[PDB]
C-alpha cells in the first residue's frame, strides 16, 4: 500500500462560530414587530430538521453558545417601553411595551440584584436619550434604533471570557435624589419569564403602586450588541438576540401611569395589561446551522462535545430551554492521508497502452 | 455566498449527519482513499449543484465583513487547488504525490487538524503545503517511473 | 468588476448585437456544437482580454452590495467549472459527457432557460448539475471505450 | 486577503530582496525559461503556502473598498489562467504557444511593462491577450505536429 | 515603524505586484502533453 496526502475541498465537517467572527444573518418571518432581514419562507428541507449527530470538535476562540451551561449566554426577558406624555391631571403617561426573550445581564448580588456594569471599550454612536420625546408619532409602529448606553452590562465574566453589551436595559425605578428616606431604590422589571410561557390566551395585568413617580431607564428601543473583550477583542454581534426572541412568543402591553392621593400624600400607579402575543420564527441559512442539545464546553482542552444533539435551521416557540444552542458553519478544506493499492499516477496514458497490447 | 436549494437530493443537515458515523473511523487511523471518497461524496455533490445566489436574501445584507472574509477563503482555496497535482483516477478530491511519513506527522496531529484545532500540537498546514509544492513539480511526476516504462514495453 | 476596454477588437455592444441573429436559431432547436462555438466565440474573447480594474472608476464606488454579489456569482461559477469534465477538442466552452435525453428535458424547458426564466416550466439547473456530477467521474470517462480500444489495435 | 505567515521558509521581504539581483538581467533582454523559473520560484512557493485568513486582523477592517478591489483583480486573473494553454513541463507558471515576434513588440515595451508602466509606449496587454486567445485553441495545439508524429513513428 | 526611525530617510508605500507577461526562450518547441515523449521512452527500452 501507498499512503499519500490528499486535499478535500468540501468535507462533510462543521466548525463552531466564535466571538471573533463577524456577525451572521438571522432571518425572522415577521417584519411588523422585528427589524430585518426578513424571510417568511419555511426551511428548504423541512424533513431534515432535527437529525441526530454526535460532535467532538475543537476551537481557537470561544464558541458562541446560548442556554444555561458554562460558556453559554443565559436568556432572559427584556422589556422595551414607549412613553407618550399626557396633558391631563389624572393620567400623566400612556405606555406601549414589548416583552421578548433576550440576553440576561449578570446580577450584582452585593446590591439588591442590580446589573453588573462596565465602562471599558465604549463605542462610537448616538447616546441613549435621557429625556422623553415630546412629539409622539405612530404609537402603533415600533421604531428600533441603535443606541449607546451610559454603561455596559456584563453578560459573562469567568474563565470562558468576558462578554459586555453597550445596549441599554430598561426598568422601572424611582429617582430618590432630593427625596426623604422613604424613597425605595430597587429596580423593578414589569414582565417576567412566565409572562411569555405560562399563558398566552389569558389576559395579563401588571400593577405598580408607590408614593413616588415611576421612571423608566435606561431609555431606548435598542437590541443587545454583545462583544468579547477578554481574553480577545472581537466585534459586536447584534444578531444573537434574534435567535432567543423566537424561542418564545413576544408579548405586547398597553397602559398608563396615573396620579391619585393616598394618606393625604401623592400616589402613583402604573397599570399594564396585555391580551396580544405574536409568534416568531428565526432561521439561519447554509452554510450555517444550529446544534441543539446538551452541549458541553471544556476551556482547558478547548473542546466542544455533545451526545445526541440535533441539527436545526430554525428556532420557534416550540423550543425547550433545557437544551443549548451552538452556532456552526460548514468547514473549509482539510488535509488527510489516504492509502492506495498502487503508486501515484498523473495520467492513464500508460494504463491505456496496456489494453492496446492485450487487445491485439 | 447565500443559496436556496429546494431541488437537491440532500441538504446541508442530511449531508453532515449522515457522514458523521463514518467520520468516527476517519478520526482514528489512516483509511483507504476509497473510504475517503465515499465519505465526502455527498458533500461534494451538494457544493457543486447550487444554481444562483438567492437575490431575495442577498439584497438585505447590511454588514459585508463576514461575506468578504468567507469569499477570500474560497478564492484562496481555489488558487491553491489550481496549482495542485492530482491522481488521474480521483476527481472529487485531489490526491497529491506527497508520501505520508508518520515519523514527521504523527496521527495525533492529523486527528487534531480534523477536529479544527490550531494549537502547537496540530498539523502545520503552511509547512506541509510548502513540502507538497516543492515535490509535485510537473518535471518530476508527469513522466511515469522507470519501472512503469519497462513494465509495459515487454510486448 | 469594472474595466475600461479601449484596445479591443469588439466591445460589449457589438458582441451582443452581432450574435443576436444566430441566437434566433439557437432558441428554436438543438444546434451542432460548431454552431454553438461560432456563436459564443467573440464573447469569450472579450471576457478573456481585460487588463486590469479601472482604478479611476473603482475608487468612487459607495455601495458595495451589488459588486460583492456579482463577484460571488463569478466565484461560484469558477468553482463549478474546475470540476467539469470537458471534451478535449473544444476549449472555449465545456462539453460534458452527459447525453441529452429530450424525454426528461423538452426543448421548451431549454428555450425558457435560454431566455432567462425561472418558473416551474423552466429547466432545473440544480437537478441537471447533480446528474452531470454523478455521471462525469474520472473513473468512468477518462479511459476510452471498449470499442475504441479494439478499434485501433488492428495494426 | 490578510494572512499571518510565521511558519514559512521565506517571507515577502526576503522573496522580494533576493530576487532583485536576477531582476536586473530580466529587464535587459530575453532570458531562458529556466532563468525565469528560478527567478519566480520562491515567490510562487510563498503564495501557495498560506493556511487561513488571520481573523484577528480581518475582523477589524472598516473600509472594504481596497480589499474588494484586490479580490476582484485576483478573481479576474484566476479566470484568465483557467483559459490559458501551457507547456506540460512547467507548472509554476504558464508558457503559452504564442511566439514572441520582436517586430511587433520591441523589448523597450516589455521592459516598460516589467517596471509597472501604462503609457502608450508600454506593452498593450489587452491586445496581446486577444492574440494569444485566438492562437491557443485546443484544436490547433493539442495534437502534436506532423514532424513529431513522423519522428517517433520510425520504429 | 517605531521611534528608532530616522527622518533623513523617506518612506514609500509598496505592494506585491500582480501577474506579468514575459517573453521566454526554450530549447525545443512548445508541447501540450508528454504523450510523444512517453512513446519515445517505450520504444527506446525495447
Ligand atoms: C412566523 O412563524 C411562526 C412560527 O411558525 C408562526 O407562528 C404560527 O402562527 C400560527 C398562526 O398564527 C399559529 O397557529 C395558530 O394556532 C392556534 C391553534 O393551533 C393549535 O391547535 C391546533 C388544533 O389541534 C393544532 O393543530 C395546532 O398544532 C396548534 O396546537 C390558534 O391560535 C390558531 O387557529 C386559527 O386557525 C384555525 C384554523 O386552522 C381556526 O380554527 C382558529 O379559529 C384560528 O383562526 C392558529 O392555528 C401557530 O401555532 C404558530 N406556530 C408556532 C407558535 O409554532 C407565525 O405565524 C409566522 N408569522 C408570520 C408568517 O407572519
Ligand atoms: C520522515 O521524517 C523523519 C523525521 O523527521 C524529523 O522530525 C520531523 C518532525 C521534522 O522536524 C523533520 O525535519 C525531522 O527530520 C525523517 O528522518 C530525518 O531525516 C533527517 C534528514 O536526513 C535527519 O537529519 C539528520 O541529522 C544529522 C545532522 O543534523 C545527520 O545525521 C544527517 O545529515 C541528517 O541531516 C534526521 O535525523 C532524521 N530523523 C530521524 C528521527 O530519523 C525522514 O527522512 C522522513 N522520511 C522520508 C523523507 O522518507
Ligand atoms: C430519459 O427520460 C425518460 C423519462 O424521464 C422521466 O421524466 C423526467 C421528466 C424525470 O421525471 C425522470 O425521472 C422520469 O423518469 C426515462 O425513462 C424513464 O425511466 C425510468 C427508469 O427506468 C422509468 O421508471 C420506471 O418506473 C417503474 C417503477 O416506478 C418501473 O417500470 C421501472 O422500475 C422504472 O423505475 C420511467 O417509467 C421511464 N419513463 C418513460 C416515460 O419511459 C429514460 O430512462 C431517460 N433516458 C435515458 C436515461 O437514456
Ligand atoms: C511580426 O510583426 C510584423 C510587424 O508587425 C507590424 O507592427 C506591429 C507593431 C503591429 O501593428 C502589426 O499589426 C504590424 O503588422 C509583421 O509583419 C507585418 O505583416 C503584415 C501582415 O502580413 C504586413 O501587412 C501588409 O501590408 C500590406 C497591406 O497593408 C500588404 O503588403 C500585405 O497584404 C500585408 O497586409 C506588414 O507590412 C508587416 N510589417 C512588417 C514591418 O514587415 C509580421 O507578420 C509578424 N511576424 C509573424 C506574425 O511571424
Ligand atoms: C450519500 O447519499 C447516498 C444517497 O445518494 C446514501 O446512500 C444510500 O444509503 C441508504 C441507507 O443505507 C441506502 O438505502 C438502503 O437500501 C436497501 C433497502 O432499500 C438496504 O441496503 C438498506 O437497508 C438501506 O435502506 C440507499 O440505497 C443508498 N443509496 C444509494 C447507494 O444510491 C449514502 O448513505 C450517503 N452517504 C453519506 C456518507 O452521507
Ligand atoms: C479507479 O477507481 C475505480 C473506482 O474506485 C476503480 O474501480 C474499482 O476497482 C476495484 C478493484 O478491482 C473494485 O473492487 C472490487 O470489485 C469487485 C466487486 O464485486 C470485487 O472483485 C471485489 O470485492 C472488489 O470490491 C471496484 O468495484 C471498482 N469500482 C468501480 C466503481 O468500478 C479502479 O480500479 C481504479 N483504477 C485504477 C486504480 O487504475
Ligand atoms: C465575431 O467577430 C468576427 C471578427 O473578429 C466576425 O467575423 C467577421 O464577419 C464579417 C461579416 O461577415 C466578415 O466580413 C466579410 O468578409 C468577406 C470579405 O473580406 C466577405 O465574406 C463579406 O463581404 C464580409 O465583408 C469578416 O471577414 C469577419 N472577420 C473575420 C472572419 O476575421 C464575426 O461576424 C463575429 N461573430 C459574431 C457571432 O459576433
Ligand atoms: C476538432 O475541431 C476542429 C475545429 O472545428 C475540427 O476541424 C474541422 O474538421 C471538419 C471535418 O473535417 C472540417 O470541415 C470540413 O472542412 C473542409 C472545408 O473545406 C471540407 O472538407 C468539408 O466541407 C468540411 O466543412 C473543418 O474545416 C475543420 N475545421 C478547422 C477549423 O480546421 C476537427 O475535426 C475536430 N477534431 C475532432 C472532432 O476529432
Ligand atoms: C530561493 O530560496 C532558496 C532557498 O529556498 C535560495 O537558495 C539558496 O541560496 C543560498 C545562497 O546562494 C544557498 O546557500 C549557499 O550554500 C553554500 C554554503 O556552502 C554555498 O554554495 C554558498 O556560499 C551559499 O551560502 C542555499 O544553498 C540555497 N538553497 C537551496 C538551493 O536550497 C535562493 O537563493 C532563493 N532565490 C531567489 C531568487 O530568491
Ligand atoms: C523539463 O524540465 C526539466 C527541469 O528543468 C528538464 O530537466 C533538465 O534537463 C536539462 C537538459 O539536460 C539539464 O541541464 C543539464 O544538466 C546537466 C547538469 O550536470 C548537464 O548535462 C548540463 O550542464 C545541463 O545543466 C538539467 O539539469 C535538468 N534539470 C533537472 C532539474 O533535472 C527537462 O529536460 C525538461 N524536459 C523536457 C524539456 O522535455
Ligand atoms: C452517538 O453516541 C451514542 C453513545 O455512544 C450512540 O448511542 C448508542 O447507539 C448504539 C447504536 O448505534 C446503541 O447500541 C447504544 O446502546 C447507544 N448508547 C450508548 C453506546 O451509550 C449513538 O448511536 C451515536 N450516534 C448518533 C446519535 O448519531
Ligand atoms: C433625578 O432628578 C434630578 C433633579 O432633581 C435630575 O437632575 C440632577 O439633579 C442633581 C441634583 O441637583 C444633579 O446633581 C445632577 O447633575 C442632575 N442631572 C442632570 C442630568 O442635570 C437627575 O438627572 C434625575 N436622575 C435620574 C436618574 O433620572
Ligand atoms: C389606565 O389603565 C387602566 C388599566 O388598563 C385602565 O383601567 C381600565 O379601564 C378600562 C376602560 O374603562 C376597563 O375596561 C378596564 O377594566 C380597566 N382596567 C382595570 C385593571 O381597572 C384605566 O382606565 C387607564 N386610565 C386612563 C386611560 O386614564
Ligand atoms: C389593555 O386594555 C385596554 C382597555 O383597558 C385595551 O384597549 C381596548 O381594546 C379593545 C379590544 O381591542 C378595543 O375595543 C377598545 O377600543 C380598546 N380601548 C378601550 C379604551 O377600551 C387594550 O387593547 C389592552 N391592551 C392590550 C395590549 O391588549
Ligand atoms: C498499509 O499496510 C500495513 C500492513 O498491513 C498497515 O499496517 C498500514 O496501516 C497500511 N497503511 C495505511 C492503511 O495507510
Ligand atoms: C505548546 O505551547 C505551550 C505553551 O504553554 C507549551 O507548554 C507546550 O510545550 C508547547 N508544545 C509543543 C511546542 O509541542
Ligand atoms: C407551476 O405553478 C403554477 C402555479 O399557479 C401551477 O398552476 C402550474 O401547474 C405549475 N406547473 C408545473 C408544476 O409544471
Ligand atoms: C504618446 O502620447 C504622447 C502625448 O503627449 C505623444 O506625444 C506621443 O507621441 C505618444 N506616443 C506614441 C503614440 O507612441
Amino acid at each position: 500500500n501507498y499512503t499519500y496526502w490528499a486535499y478535500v475541498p468540501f468535507p462533510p465537517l462543521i466548525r463552531a462560530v466564535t466571538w471573533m467572527d463577524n456577525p451572521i444573518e438571522v432571518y425572522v418571518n415577521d417584519s411588523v414587530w422585528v427589524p430585518g432581514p426578513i424571510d417568511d419562507r419555511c426551511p428548504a428541507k423541512p424533513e431534515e430538521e432535527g437529525m441526530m449527530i454526535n460532535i467532538s470538535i475543537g476551537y481557537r476562540y470561544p464558541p458562541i453558545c446560548l442556554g444555561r451551561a458554562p460558556g453559554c449566554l443565559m436568556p432572559a426577558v427584556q422589556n422595551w417601553l414607549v412613553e407618550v406624555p399626557t396633558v391631563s391631571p389624572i393620567s400623566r403617561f400612556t405606555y406601549h411595551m414589548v416583552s421578548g426573550m433576550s440576553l440576561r445581564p449578570r446580577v450584582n448580588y452585593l446590591q439588591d440584584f442590580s446589573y453588573q456594569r462596565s465602562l471599558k471599550f465604549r463605542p462610537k454612536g448616538k447616546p441613549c436619550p435621557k429625556e422623553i420625546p415630546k412629539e409622539s408619532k405612530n404609537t402603533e409602529v415600533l421604531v428600533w434604533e441603535e443606541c449607546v448606553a451610559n454603561s455596559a452590562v456584563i453578560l459573562q465574566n469567568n474563565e470562558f471570557g468576558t462578554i459586555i453589551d453597550w445596549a441599554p436595559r430598561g426598568q422601572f425605578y424611582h429617582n430618590c435624589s432630593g427625596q426623604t428616606q422613604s424613597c425605595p431604590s430597587a429596580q423593578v422589571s414589569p414582565a417576567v419569564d412566565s409572562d411569555l410561557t405560562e399563558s398566552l390566551d389569558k389576559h395579563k395585568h401588571k400593577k405598580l403602586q408607590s408614593f413616588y413617580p415611576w421612571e423608566w431607564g435606561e431609555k431606548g428601543i435598542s437590541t443587545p450588541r454583545p462583544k468579547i473583550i477578554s481574553p480577545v477583542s472581537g466585534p459586536e454581534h447584534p444578531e444573537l438576540w434574534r435567535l432567543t426572541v423566537a424561542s418564545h412568543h413576544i408579548r405586547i402591553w398597553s397602559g398608563n401611569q396615573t396620579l391619585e392621593t393616598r394618606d393625604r400624600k401623592p400616589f402613583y400607579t402604573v397599570d399594564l395589561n396585555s391580551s396580544l402575543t405574536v409568534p416568531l420564527q428565526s432561521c439561519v441559512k447554509p452554510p450555517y446551522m444550529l446544534v441543539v442539545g446538551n452541549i458541553v464546553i471544556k476551556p482547558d482542552s478547548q473542546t466542544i462535545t455533545c451526545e445526541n444533539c440535533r441539527l436545526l435551521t430554525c428556532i420557534d416557540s416550540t423550543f425547550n430551554w433545557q437544551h443549548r444552542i451552538l452556532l456552526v458553519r460548514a468547514r473549509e478544506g482539510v488535509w488527510i492521508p489516504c492509502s492506495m493499492d498502487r503508486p501515484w499516477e498523473a495520467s492513464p496514458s500508460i494504463h491505456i497502452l496496456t489494453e492496446v497490447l492485450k487487445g491485439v | 455566498f447565500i443559496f436556496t436549494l429546494i431541488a437537491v437530493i440532500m441538504g446541508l443537515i442530511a449531508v453532515t449527519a449522515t457522514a458523521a458515523v463514518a467520520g468516527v473511523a476517519l478520526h482514528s487511523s489512516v483509511q483507504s482513499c476509497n473510504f475517503v471518497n465515499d465519505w465526502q461524496k455527498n458533500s461534494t455533490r451538494l457544493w457543486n449543484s447550487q444554481s444562483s445566489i438567492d437575490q431575495k436574501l442577498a439584497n438585505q445584507i447590511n454588514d459585508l465583513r463576514q461575506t468578504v472574509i468567507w469569499m477570500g477563503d474560497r478564492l484562496m482555496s481555489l488558487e491553491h487547488r489550481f496549482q495542485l497535482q492530482c491522481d488521474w483516477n480521483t476527481s472529487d478530491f485531489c490526491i497529491t504525490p506527497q508520501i505520508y511519513n508518520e515519523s514527521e506527522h504523527h496521527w495525533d496531529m492529523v486527528r487534531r487538524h480534523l477536529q479544527g484545532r490550531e494549537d502547537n500540537l496540530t498539523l502545520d498546514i503552511s509547512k506541509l503545503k510548502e513540502q507538497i509544492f516543492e515535490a509535485s513539480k510537473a518535471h518530476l511526476n508527469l513522466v511515469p517511473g522507470t519501472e512503469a516504462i519497462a513494465g509495459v514495453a515487454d510486448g
Side-chain angles (χ1 to χ4, degrees), chain B:
Chain B
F1 38 86
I2 179 154
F3 310 96
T4 294
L5 296 182
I6 308 290
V8 294
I9 172 171
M10 283 164 84
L12 189 54
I13 291 178
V15 160
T16 317
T18 304
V21 194
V24 171
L26 213 57
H27 281 82
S28 70
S29 49
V30 187
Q31 306 295 321
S32 73
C33 306
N34 296 115
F35 185 95
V36 180
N37 176 74
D38 280 4
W39 163 79
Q40 54 83 61
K41 193 176 50 179
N42 293 331
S43 191
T44 307
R45 183 180 53 190
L46 168 65
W47 292 109
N48 273 105
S49 68
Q50 59 249 63
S51 175
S52 54
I53 282 171
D54 191 277
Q55 187 176 3
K56 177 169 175 282
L57 300 182
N59 64 6
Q60 302 184 74
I61 287 165
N62 290 324
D63 190 7
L64 281 169
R65 281 164 189 84
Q66 185 77 342
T67 293
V68 170
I69 292 169
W70 186 85
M71 274 171 60
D73 189 79
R74 295 292 291 264
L75 185 57
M76 182 260 268
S77 178
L78 202 52
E79 295 178 53
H80 290 179
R81 286 169 65 199
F82 188 65
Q83 204 93 47
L84 292 171
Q85 281 283 343
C86 317
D87 198 275
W88 67 272
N89 205 35
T90 293
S91 44
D92 290 354
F93 59 103
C94 180
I95 302 179
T96 81
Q98 175 72 60
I99 290 163
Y100 176 57
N101 189 349
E102 200 202 11
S103 309
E104 175 195 7
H105 307 296
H106 312 77
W107 188 253
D108 171 64
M109 331 187 66
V110 187
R111 174 197 282 123
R112 289 187 98 94
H113 166 71
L114 292 190
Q115 297 169 333
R117 309 179 168 279
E118 272 178 344
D119 46 346
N120 57 9
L121 293 189
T122 313
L123 165 77
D124 189 16
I125 301 303
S126 277
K127 194 170 286 291
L128 179 72
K129 278 172 132 159
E130 264 179 351
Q131 301 170 262
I132 288 175
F133 177 78
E134 57 211 358
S136 308
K137 298 286 160 56
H139 74 277
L140 311 156
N141 285 281
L142 279 192
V143 164
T146 306
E147 294 173 1
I149 301 299
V152 66
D154 55 358

Side-chain angles (χ1 to χ4, degrees), chain A residues 77-133 135-136 138-339:
Chain A
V77 174
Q78 187 173 349
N79 297 282
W80 296 272
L81 189 84
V82 177
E83 314 176 74
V84 170
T86 297
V87 185
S88 296
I90 49 169
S91 183
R92 325 279 318 160
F93 289 101
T94 44
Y95 295 125
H96 301 284
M97 200 170 80
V98 178
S99 315
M101 207 57 163
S102 173
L103 311 184
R104 187 193 171 253
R106 288 296 165 167
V107 161
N108 258 326
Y109 292 118
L110 266 48
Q111 283 72 245
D112 194 1
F113 301 132
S114 64
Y115 299 149
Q116 306 191 15
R117 311 306 291 242
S118 175
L119 294 174
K120 287 176 217 76
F121 309 109
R122 192 198 160 84
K124 313 282 168 285
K126 193 190 65 185
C128 292
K130 279 195 76 172
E131 95 284 347
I132 308 174
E135 274 83 0
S136 65
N138 315 317
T139 74
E140 78 270 359
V141 180
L142 191 63
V143 194
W144 298 91
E145 59 89 21
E146 187 273 341
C147 192
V148 183
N150 220 35
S151 197
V153 288
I154 301 176
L155 305 181
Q156 179 187 277
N157 204 18
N158 56 13
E159 72 269 23
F160 292 88
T162 305
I163 312 292
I164 72 162
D165 186 14
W166 274 96
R169 297 302 203 275
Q171 274 173 311
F172 267 124
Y173 70 97
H174 303 306
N175 186 319
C176 281
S177 68
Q179 305 299 326
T180 56
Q181 78 180 47
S182 280
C183 179
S185 284
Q187 302 293 323
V188 173
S189 288
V192 290
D193 306 293
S194 50
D195 285 303
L196 298 184
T197 65
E198 282 298 327
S199 295
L200 288 187
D201 50 306
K202 306 311 215 58
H203 295 346
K204 303 280 184 187
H205 289 267
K206 190 68 199 290
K207 182 184 278 297
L208 300 186
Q209 291 176 299
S210 82
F211 281 110
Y212 301 86
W214 297 92
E215 317 287 310
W216 184 258
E218 188 161 357
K219 296 180 205 295
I221 316 296
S222 188
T223 52
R225 312 182 299 274
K227 68 181 180 197
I228 192 149
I229 60 160
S230 190
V232 288
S233 171
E236 286 170 7
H237 287 270
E239 81 277 9
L240 299 191
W241 88 280
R242 300 167 75 76
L243 289 173
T244 65
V245 75
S247 59
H248 297 278
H249 288 57
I250 59 155
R251 192 162 277 281
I252 294 91
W253 307 75
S254 54
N256 60 74
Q257 181 165 200
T258 48
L259 165 63
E260 74 183 1
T261 295
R262 174 169 293 186
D263 306 330
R264 304 168 305 285
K265 317 197 290 286
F267 210 56
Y268 301 86
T269 298
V270 166
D271 281 330
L272 299 168
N273 64 282
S274 193
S275 62
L276 184 65
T277 52
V278 185
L280 303 172
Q281 199 185 59
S282 291
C283 307
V284 290
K285 295 293 154 49
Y288 291 98
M289 284 179 293
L290 311 169
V291 176
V292 173
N294 283 295
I295 293 142
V296 186
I297 300 158
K298 293 153 296 308
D300 62 358
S301 52
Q302 306 216 358
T303 307
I304 306 160
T305 304
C306 166
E307 297 298 278
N308 300 326
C309 280
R310 300 174 298 133
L311 286 166
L312 279 82
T313 286
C314 295
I315 298 293
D316 57 9
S317 297
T318 49
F319 184 79
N320 195 227
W321 272 117
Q322 90 190 340
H323 295 135
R324 280 83 67 192
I325 305 167
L326 172 70
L327 283 73
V328 292
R329 189 179 79 192
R331 197 169 157 193
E332 66 278 1
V334 294
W335 291 88
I336 181 158
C338 74
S339 62

